[PDB]
């Protein structure tokens, strides 16, 4: 699966560089809304079945690593650049840019990474129609397929 | 420590070896098993399954549970008698068996 | 090669450093134990690095020799205190070996 | 940790080996507190691979 | 109500379903969205393994 993960990441990077049209953006927005509602902002441990709990937590952890940690890293890099700039300017150590600039960088970089990897998170929640999470995921998938005039798993 | 270990080894393995040296008319197998039990059931190579999670991961733990059940299925085994039971769940997390004793076969853990 | 099912278990190269194969459960356990063996040496390695640094820096006659006035040793249980680490090594070895056995 | 727990630190130093390496032993903690992170994280990854 | 002989094999019963309508069994099974992909993967694995 390392090869599969590398291929998925490279495909997402290429798609992001390519850009998105109106229909693709609408589908991605729906996927991101579903993921945020059911995984990111919801405690996975509150689901009914153990299988769906485990798979939802796997999706949540993958989302954390691929979005939250990456955005924190990029925002920290931006805040460190700003910190170096201000340290050079004032010829002294400054602590204000770290928190504020880091938060701004995280807020800027979370949407882009979420858009880049929206499809992967949406697909990882396909537990099955036998569960509430899987049923909602299937409904959102049907909506996205209708929007995009294509069929996806 | 070495002397105590050697004394225990002697008591289990050396002195009992001389108890029986010829065919026995009465209860030969019983006496042979009596002398062999103390040597074949030493805790050094029996104890440890109670803390198997130290080396066995959950999935590995379940696979090794089924493997050990198959290996020690033989009723005539004092080592199996003295060994800790395999009919238990991984303390950290269990993925295969939800409840202990709820199987479809009295031998296979699944 | 049993048809399209590749049954070969060893794919080691000319300069292999690890085990020939890692499919066997015994070899997997041995590899994991060996990898985690070296994880528990941080404090000892740092202490030895500091000792070497200090000896190379200040313990030469040129810089800072020390007058060793002690006549005879007086240690009584330092051996017991120090042999806890080899005790842990032995405990880990016994645990892994018995689990495999 | 170590000698501080004893109310006779001279005896603590004498009874073990009659040698003094306390400076290095106590300066090694700072380095040891961070030298282990890469190995620990790679080991976490390897353990996850074994579990999979 | 049941006919009091539920489960009895009719005399001369033949285990044939030549003209049976399978549309009534649609609701008794659930197929995931990737059923076609699973079918193709199963066929590939069976061909390359057996």
């Amino acid at each position: 699966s390392c090869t599969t993960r590398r291929f998925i990441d490279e495909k997402e990077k290429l798609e992001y560089s390519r850009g998105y049209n109106q229909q693709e953006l609408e589908a991605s927005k729906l996927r991101k809304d579903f993921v945020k509602k059911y995984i990111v902002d919801f405690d996975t441990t509150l689901y009914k079945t153990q299988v769906e709990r485990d798979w939802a937590y796997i999706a949540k952890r993958e989302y954390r690593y691929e979005v939250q940690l990456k955005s924190i890293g990029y925002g920290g890099a931006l805040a460190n650049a700003v910190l170096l700039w201000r340290i050079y300017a004032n010829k002294k150590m400054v602590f204000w840019p770290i928190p504020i600039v880091g938060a701004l960088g995280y807020l800027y970089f979370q949407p882009v990474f979420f858009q880049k990897s929206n499809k992967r998170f949406f697909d990882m929640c396909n537990v099955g129609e036998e569960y509430y999470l899987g049923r909602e995921r299937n409904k959102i998938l049907r909506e996205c397929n209708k929007i995009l005039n294509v069929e996806d798993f | 420590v070495c002397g105590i270990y050697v004394i225990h080894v002697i008591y289990n393995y050396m002195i009992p070896y001389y108890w029986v040296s010829t065919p026995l008319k009465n209860d030969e197998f019983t006496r042979l098993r009596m002398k062999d039990y103390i040597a074949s059931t030493v805790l050094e190579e029996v104890y440890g399954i109670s803390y198997a999670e130290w080396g066995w991961l959950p999935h590995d733990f379940a696979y090794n549970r089924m493997r050990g059940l198959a290996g020690y299925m033989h009723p005539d085994d004092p080592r199996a008698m003295c060994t800790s039971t395999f009919h238990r769940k991984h303390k950290y997390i269990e993925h295969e068996v939800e409840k202990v004793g709820d199987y479809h076969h009295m031998t296979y853990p699944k | 090669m049993w048809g399209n099912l590749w049954t070969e278990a060893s794919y080691q190269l000319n300069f292999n450093i690890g085990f020939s194969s890692l499919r066997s459960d015994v070899l997997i356990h041995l590899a994991q134990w060996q990898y985690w063996w070296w994880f528990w040496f941080a404090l000892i390695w740092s202490f030895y690095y500091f000792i070497i640094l200090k000896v190379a820096r200040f313990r030469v006659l040129k810089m800072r020799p020390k007058i060793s006035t002690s006549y005879r040793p007086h240690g009584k249980w330092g051996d017991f205190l120090a042999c806890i680490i080899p005790l842990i090594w032995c405990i880990n070895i016994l645990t892994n070996s018995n689990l495999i056995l | 940790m170590g000698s501080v727990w004893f109310r006779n630190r001279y005896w603590w130093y004498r009874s073990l080996y009659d040698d003094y390496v306390a400076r290095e032993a106590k300066l090694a903690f700072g380095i040891a507190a961070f030298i282990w992170l890469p190995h620990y994280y790679w080991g976490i990854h390897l353990n996850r691979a074994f579990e999979v | 109500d049941l006919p009091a002989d539920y489960g009895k094999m009719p005399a001369g019963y033949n285990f044939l379903t030549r003209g049976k309508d399978w549309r009534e069994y649609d609701k008794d099974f659930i197929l995931r969205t990737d059923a076609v992909w699973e079918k193709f993967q199963l066929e590939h694995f069976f061909r390359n393994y057996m």
Partner: peptide, 20 residues
């Protein structure tokens, strides 16, 4: 031993059957 492995990936679940 106690925590010689230093970590256990309890998150990794048993792979779910997906056959039709």
């Amino acid at each position: 031993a106690l925590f010689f492995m230093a970590n256990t990936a309890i998150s990794v679940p048993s792979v779910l059957d997906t056959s039709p």
